[PDB]
Design an enzyme around this catalytic site. Structure first.
Site, PDB file in Angstrom:
ATOM      1  N   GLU B  81       0.784  -1.222   0.000  1.00  0.00           N
ATOM      2  CA  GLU B  81       0.000   0.000   0.000  1.00  0.00           C
ATOM      3  C   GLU B  81       0.827   1.289   0.000  1.00  0.00           C
ATOM      4  OE1 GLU B  81      -3.198   0.004  -0.357  1.00  0.00           O
ATOM      5  OE2 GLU B  81      -3.610  -2.129  -0.039  1.00  0.00           O
ATOM      6  N   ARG B  91     -18.107  -0.631   7.837  1.00  0.00           N
ATOM      7  CA  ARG B  91     -19.386  -1.030   7.273  1.00  0.00           C
ATOM      8  C   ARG B  91     -19.912  -2.273   8.014  1.00  0.00           C
ATOM      9  NH1 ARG B  91     -18.196  -1.349   0.827  1.00  0.00           N
ATOM     10  NH2 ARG B  91     -16.901  -2.974   1.826  1.00  0.00           N
ATOM     11  N   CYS B 144      -7.559  -2.805   8.753  1.00  0.00           N
ATOM     12  CA  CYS B 144      -6.261  -2.833   8.061  1.00  0.00           C
ATOM     13  C   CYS B 144      -5.710  -1.417   7.845  1.00  0.00           C
ATOM     14  CB  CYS B 144      -6.371  -3.461   6.725  1.00  0.00           C
ATOM     15  SG  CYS B 144      -6.831  -5.283   6.817  1.00  0.00           S
ATOM     16  N   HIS B 168      -1.313  -5.793   1.614  1.00  0.00           N
ATOM     17  CA  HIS B 168      -2.518  -6.636   1.552  1.00  0.00           C
ATOM     18  C   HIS B 168      -2.263  -7.838   0.662  1.00  0.00           C
ATOM     19  CE1 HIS B 168      -5.405  -3.398   3.032  1.00  0.00           C
ATOM     20  NE2 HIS B 168      -5.819  -4.544   3.530  1.00  0.00           N
TER      21      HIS B 168
END
Lengths: 207, 209, 207, 206
Positions: B81, B91, B144, B168
């Site tokens: 990332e 969510r 994460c 990831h």
């Protein structure tokens, strides 16, 4: 004991590897349970592919035939339910043939069903932790051509043989420049071995 | 120059029974390759507590490099990332029932932190071994990204010499038996993370490809 | 009351013959919808120059709200962007041959800027009208993200009262005839952008 | 003048709208060029769908039949090349039937090819700016069932009739809670009308 002939294709398009041959080549000489496996390579060429398959059939006198091909983009091992009587090529084969709207067998049926117990095969592969599902289209390129030709040759001349086709995803090394799903060659090889053993062990499928 | 590389993976979450990020990094605990000496610690999939656990692992190991790992189901490549954002937007709840919405991770902190790892080099070395990899520009907004932003904030404020970042990984095949989805084998994911640790240990500077 | 809303869309980019981001926003030029008074200006698909053109459009119109629009081919929804990042990373050149790699947009500027638009409200109001929408957390690293970061940087440093942000739109169907991809009709995209402009003019605050 | 019968499905579980029916209903009674169109709704039920289709065929005496169904997830209008002799349902139909590994016609062929000039239809739809492509699987649910049953009826009883199936994507209002591709109901309707006209104008494909 049953003799299982597996076939894999040579690389096509700009590819340098075809996981179908790399996986089946690893299983040449493998035996487990009721299965004894032999492997042969088929060229990614219309018409010629079927001639090579017929020669391998004469050489090995197999009881079971599983032709394997690559379906880039898929995310599971996918045994095929049905072969169709049509060559419809989006790109040319390795010798430049690019048939469009062409019958594979003039006057032959529109389709042939697979002769392998594919639901049992899908379940035995999933039991081993590898994704698998039945597919209802093998495309219209050389893989479907070989599948239709195999079932036609079986129906007309060697009905004792239990034959069919299994597509497999790309392997990881084929997805380095453009993102796409893949399965490892180790997992694909294991799945094909499970397919061969399962077909050898069961003539009849489950529901 | 030997470098101590701390890898983290998450504890069990989402109705899943295996968190592949931990399965992979646990295999590397105690591994030595090139100039990397690797140690692995598990972090809980819980907002706030995850960062406390990370800090405790940092104190325990005094690492030179830190690579936190999590799973991004649906992706088809190993994805280091580039950027962490200052937002918790859940969510679904975390393992302890926390479901923050619209929340700053560091109040008044920067909107984002860039990775401290040589991620373009890591992507190229993973691909040289035949495993798909690509730089990602969003780590999401769940635990994460929370851990990634917290890691970069702790480095910036308290240990700026540490080179840290986040990677990831996709699902492993065994997670894709009921609903089709892309995956990478645990063996390939583990190898890719080992490559990332060695690459970061061997090079402080990234390439510009 | 009245809020002046400046919308932007991009000029044509190679391979394309019309850019849909402009085609949609140009339809709203001069529109009075709710408290919004909308004006539309075209920006070139060029690093650096796009920001200069945006600055001139801001001087010309003295907007209260600015919504820059770009196309994210492959997406399936209208997607207002949450965050702009300080990086130009181009896999292909822009319209004037610039292909920056690993470049800061503002040297010493923040790594990112958050949007100034009430994007959750906007997404909900678009869905209320039957059009798909969702918040996105990456605008990419090409000219779209570049214009988004530059807009927020200009607002922060020089015109802090303005509420600005960026919305990406999918392909239109006519762009997906040779290679399959998701799309939304130009009429639905135009309606969604009108809803976004009205929503932002009616609400500074997000839900 | 060719009488073209279009069919669309009744409401299915979860949906309050079947767009295949919403689109073809709009075309009922439409006349364009050589096409005179009529539309009828068929239930999303195995076996009963075929009975309703046969009744519609008896009533209208169509020259051309195009049955339409929704294939959520696709991003183009897709005329189908081949129907297969299998009901394999992963979910039940509207009356709870969930056939597994069952032939549609005992003794019928493994597959039937479409009788429509589908390459012409794909090209004419793309000429109007709407995405379209040929599909080689209509699935194994009620849509493929209706397609195979149609072709078996044609073979069976009216070989001169030209028939086939076309799948359509979701409409946007069906993709608000879970992202997925879609095409507008107006574009789907226009594509279906182009299909009907093209089929009426041409017996032969390109």
């Amino acid at each position: 004991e049953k003799k299982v002939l597996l076939t894999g294709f040579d690389p096509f398009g700009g590819e340098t590897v075809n996981p179908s041959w790399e996986a089946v080549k690893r299983l040449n000489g493998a035996a487990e349970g009721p299965a004894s496996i032999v492997s042969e390579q088929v060229p990614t060429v219309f018409y010629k592919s079927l001639a090579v398959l017929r020669e391998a059939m004469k050489k090995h006198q197999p009881d079971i035939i599983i032709c394997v091909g690559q379906a880039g983009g898929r995310m599971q091992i996918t045994p095929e339910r049905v072969a169709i009587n049509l060559n419809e090529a989006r790109i040319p084969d390795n010798e430049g043939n690019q048939p469009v709207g062409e019958d594979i067998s003039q006057g032959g049926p529109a389709a042939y069903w697979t002769g392998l117990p594919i639901k049992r095969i899908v379940e035995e592969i999933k039991k081993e932790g590898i994704p698998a599902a039945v597919s209802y289209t093998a495309g219209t390129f050389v893989c479907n051509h070989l599948f239709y030709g195999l079932m036609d040759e079986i129906s007309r001349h060697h009905p004792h043989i239990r034959g069919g086709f299994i597509h497999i995803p790309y392997i990881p090394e084929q997805t380095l420049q453009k993102s796409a799903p893949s399965l490892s060659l180790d997992h694909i090889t294991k799945a094909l071995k499970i397919a061969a053993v399962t077909a050898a062990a069961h003539e009849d499928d489950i529901e």
